[PDB]
Amino acid sequence: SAGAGAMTIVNRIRTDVVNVAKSFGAEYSEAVIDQIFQGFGEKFTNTGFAIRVQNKRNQKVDCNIRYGEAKENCLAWDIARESGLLSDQGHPVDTLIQEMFQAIPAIAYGADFDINYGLVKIWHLPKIVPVEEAFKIPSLPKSVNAHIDFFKKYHLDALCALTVDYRNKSTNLYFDAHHPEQRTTQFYKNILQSQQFEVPSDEVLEILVNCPEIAVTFNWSSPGIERMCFYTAFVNRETVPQHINPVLKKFAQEAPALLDNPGFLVGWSFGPKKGTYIKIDVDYHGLVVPSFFHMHNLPLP
């Protein structure tokens, strides 16, 4: 019953995470997993926890584990620092999450880990606010302010989250995709063409029109948008569009969850020639998907 039988919930989670990673061929480090769980295992037990796989072109599938909770302070930061998971790099990212919590009041936060690396991101979640609130933050890439007209044009006026990616040295702004233009396939063709990204098939465009949340990624090395991502949730295994991609099919059918009937969040990422791939998270305790609809003021499907 080392990894089986009667076990604490946190041990059930660890075993499930390693099983996913093995099944999808994702790399992982036992030392990094243990280090993450020493600090964060209790959080993973009691809050909105998810396991993600994603399939970047020409590399192995990555396996991430992440959680969020409705606390106004950035609790992950202290835990990660103490855990040896978050060292300064001599870079704008070092103070950015602190600046975000100073600049805009948070109603929740979360953290994201790649089990082959350690802590990748911390998220800041405010109540929905005008995007201009972000321009207060000292260490944001200069490219963010420079995209004021782009945000306005594409109805990216309602900021619903921020993140710092310590590994990638980038930041995402997340928008509530409330505008009726965002219910049309042309919107997605247009916003993707504005950046010279890849435009997906019609079948994928017809999925995107239901997206409640759009992320846009900025970095300090370039003036342009690195990639963007459209998030769509599915309330159970069967309603994931399993036919679109083999990773979607396999993960929907086989992802572990403690709750018998989990939903999923899928991120459709696009970039220039990387940046284009799919992310899928299983709602391991069943808390994430309802919270996702609620945070976007949408009835639960």
Ligand SMILES: CC(C)=CCSP(=O)(O)OP(=O)(O)O
């Ligand atoms: C759960 C929400 C709605 C979005 C999470 S941000 P993300 O993990 O998709 O960000 P990246 O893939 O790191 O850009």
